[PDB]
């Protein structure tokens, strides 16, 4: 949407909302960011059942995907959403941050 | 404060304090009468409170403030007008 607006679901079970996250996401094409909201240390399970299922580059629980809240940062070591792109667009194609190694190239010499 | 007392009765009694309690110390009351041209203080209050929002304040203010309600905290302050809504 990229505009201030938003669409909800109504999800029936753990489970259920999962399978509508994955489905979710693969519309997007690129897998870039999700985020759980849960309690926290009474769930292990459920945090990473559902880090099971979804493969996008990076998963945020209880967290906002966007930079600053009180002070440093929220979260405060954290590349930028943006810089995150891929060789590929195809499909799963899981976000890497570019780096200098990707702008150089190499040499051995062998003695 | 009275004993028997609201919140806000026990603010505006210490606001008042501190109102007086600055009189008694024969300090201006508005910036104007602090000795101001005011023309151009709102021709550069503008850009004055812009740099005002992120200096540093940032800030353990408890609630944002934005660009606008400077403006009129400052406004108000230069004419010693009570910042009040």
């Known amino acids: 949407?990229?505009?201030?607006?938003?669409?909800?679901?109504?999800?029936?079970?753990?489970?259920?909302?999962?399978?509508?996250?994955?489905?979710?996401?693969?519309?997007?094409?690129?897998?870039?960011?999700?985020?759980?909201?849960?309690?926290?240390?009474?769930?292990?399970?459920?945090?990473?059942?559902?880090?099971?299922?979804?493969?996008?580059?990076?998963?945020?629980?209880?967290?906002?995907?966007?930079?600053?809240?009180?002070?440093?940062?929220?979260n405060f070591n954290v590349a930028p959403s943006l810089t995150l792109g891929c060789g590929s667009w195809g499909g799963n194609s899981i976000s890497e941050n570019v780096g200098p190694k990707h702008l150089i190239n190499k040499k051995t010499v062998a003695k | 404060s009275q004993p028997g007392d609201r919140t806000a009765q026990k603010i505006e009694r210490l606001l008042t304090w501190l109102d007086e309690l600055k009189v008694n110390l024969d300090i201006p009351k508005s910036i104007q009468a602090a000795g101001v041209a005011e023309a151009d203080f709102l021709a550069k209050v503008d850009e004055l409170a812009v740099e005002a929002f992120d200096d540093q304040c940032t800030g353990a203010n408890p609630r944002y403030p934005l660009i606008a309600e400077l403006k009129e905290v400052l406004l108000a302050s230069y004419y010693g007008k009570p910042f009040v809504e």
């Open chain 1, 1 to 74: 949407k990229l505009s201030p607006t938003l669409g909800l679901f109504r999800a029936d079970n753990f489970e259920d909302a999962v399978a509508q996250a994955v489905t979710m996401v693969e519309i997007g094409g690129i897998g870039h960011t999700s985020g759980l909201y849960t309690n926290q240390d009474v769930n292990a399970d459920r945090i990473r059942y559902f880090g099971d299922k979804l493969k996008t580059a990076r998963i945020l629980v209880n967290i906002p995907t966007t930079h600053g809240g009180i002070g440093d940062l929220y």
